[model samples]
Target: LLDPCGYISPESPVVQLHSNFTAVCVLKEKCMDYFHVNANYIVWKTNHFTIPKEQYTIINRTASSVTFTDIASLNIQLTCNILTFGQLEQNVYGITIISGLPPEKPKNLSCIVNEGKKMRCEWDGGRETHLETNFTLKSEWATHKFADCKAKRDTPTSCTVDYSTVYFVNIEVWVEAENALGKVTSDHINFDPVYKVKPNPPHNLSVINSEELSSILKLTWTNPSIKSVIILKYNIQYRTKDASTWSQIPPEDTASTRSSFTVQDLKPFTEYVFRIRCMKEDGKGYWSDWSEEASGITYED
Candidate 1:
């Protein structure tokens, strides 16, 4: 209910710093019913400030009215500058344990490898909801060596992995969402694939014959005892080990390392398994070691 529609003169930083503030949020009964609709201008903030499309300008829009006049300006200034409203676009479809190992804390663990190795690792504990779901996952590799994993449920949540060591695993996923507004339990996401130093493992990979197309895959190697100092993002995994498991490899094409990858709909000799884990963002800090062996098999008919 904050719609008095605001704006000042000099691009309003409070009318460009001359000081004449009078910001108010005085409410008396009109804020919750999912935020009492009926608006003229009150979109507050969805995190704005990215303009630069030739300085963009579109002064007064139509279809329900909007008057900003210029060329088109989001030169915002609703006074002190701030807008916050939440919940929308969330149709997640499973996988929201949020934290690591559950059941009350059952030796926590986590893993994921898709695209053919079809490995799906999960820890688990109190969290489930859906508008749709995708849980289908399974892994078992108690302590490295040739690690084992499996996957096939297809919805509620999903995971997969196979690196051979750092085991201690157990994961079961399931959920379905539709009239959801309740079902929240997430806070654990631990995975120990076991490794002392080796982030591009799967065996010192290399496949950059280079040509310059697009679906590029240039994975590089040499972890040098990866001890973690931040800087790491290579979590690509492929599938087709005869069609039974392995997925991931989706970060737009999965983070590239020059080791090489320009695949797109690929379908040749078909035997793929690529692994690389040097992760560092997402609660960033702590949890290092484990990731030395990678798996791979790819060829173009």
Candidate 2:
């Protein structure tokens, strides 16, 4: 049932954040001697301090028309009070204000291939707008191939592309953001998934050299923390302290069921630098970053 004594104008119950909103209270019967519209936040009942005269403006005031601009608030309640003789008649109205902004171009965009298992891209939303924002990851290839990455959450800025088969060739990828206010897209980036494969570096590298057998240098390292489903092969490279070139072990000779390796034929009295890197056995992805440098000097005997 609508109140007949007084009603709010432009009866919309909602408005955009930071946007101008104006409303008027009117009385059907001009019997009241005085009328005032008191604006208040429904949630913060005690926030009825003096209204900021600059923001909440009073445009027109009469016995019937009392127009005013409302200050922006998350939630507001408008009470129109009328004084007739010694009694006051009051009516309350509700207003809901929404806050949001057009999406910003996602920042810090990056993508990685998880060794043919999955491809994931991540980015950052520029700022929080106190509203729901959606992010979508999109990709395209030269073969007219288009795919939508999966975003698990409404506020997520990352997507997981589980379709590994479509990533064999070069492709362009980007992210799109949208909310109640507007939509925006990030700058597109291009790359080949094969070239983007980056496995974690090997860890716990240790070197051992014998005092009596000065020519043999033993090297050992633990595999990366994450072991992919596919088999990986290691490549070992060594160089003397003063040498300009490195001596690398034959790829086939470095194949191993263990993480340890033996480097023979070294100078009996020279210090050598050794480091190792790994790649998938079937040659599908990029080489893992090199292991930490380990140095050892052969015995002087």
Candidate 3:
């Protein structure tokens, strides 16, 4: 609550760093008579330290002003006091000075879509503003505006969008950072979400040898869930149980999606290890992590 007897012109003021600032305190007739004081008796202090007499301005018998030529601190408490009848200091009014620069333009803005979840975008926060800043993640498609995603914390560097993503269509995204000082936005980035997806790894891998085929192993695995939305390609590699080097099937052979492959020319009676991974057929997105290792012995000669 503001003081009933007197008040500062600006209750709480915000100042840009290195700028001039001033606040005036005015007194009611009752307050001046009761305390036997006028503007001549008024003194000024900031954050507990008294300002020199030369920095004060006596506007009239009932008002006084204090000026700070260059406000540099992030926060300050400026009080107007009176040396009253008892020569006692009585605080009549005060104002808090909040000072800081504006947030800088966000940089390196980018985003990623992890299959099965929402898209998360992050960026460089740039120089510190020394104030409470907010980030609004803005997104939209061809001609429609998607909802803005807000950061849950002050001065956040990232935000996860709340809604499901649309693939193939190019959506533009960027962020705006704002606070008491100013607001600034990053440059826009445009992309198709399908190109940002990092698909889940294929699982349940199994390899088995054919009873009569002495030099071959058959590999099988389940594809990632995203396969329903887009076709997938694969990587198939084999190594002897104790071999240091891995051998990959020609890229041409595994260019399409299939559950099984017959690996040929393996050593008979030897155990072989195989690992496989998958990605979008056109390789526009990331490959899933390699499947768990599967081993099977080639049939004996």
TM-score of each: 0.17, 0.53, 0.83
Off by over 4 Å in 1: 1-121, 124-131, 134-155, 159-181, 187-198, 202-301
All candidates' lDDT scores? Answer: 0.33, 0.64, 0.87
The residue-by-residue lDDT of candidate 3 on 1-301, one tens digit each, is 5446688887888778889887998888899999888898888898799989898899999889988768778899888888887778888888888998889999999888878889989898988778888999999997999889998775499888998989879999999999988889999999998887777877888987754788888988888888787788888989999999998998789998788899998888999999998888888877887889898888788
lDDT of 2 at 113: 70
lDDT of 1 by residue, 26-51 (tens): 21123222334222222222124322
Top-lDDT structure, candidate number: 3
Better of 1 and 3 by TM-score: 3
Full-model lDDT, candidate 1: 0.33
In terms of lDDT, the poorest run of 10 residues in model 2 is: 37-46
Worst 10 residues of 3 by lDDT: 1-10
lDDT of 2 by residue, 65-107 (tens): 2223443565565444443334543343333344445677897
Q: 16 in model 1: Cα distance from truth in Å?
A: 57
lDDT of 1 at 164: 31
Question: Number of clashes in model 2?
Answer: 0
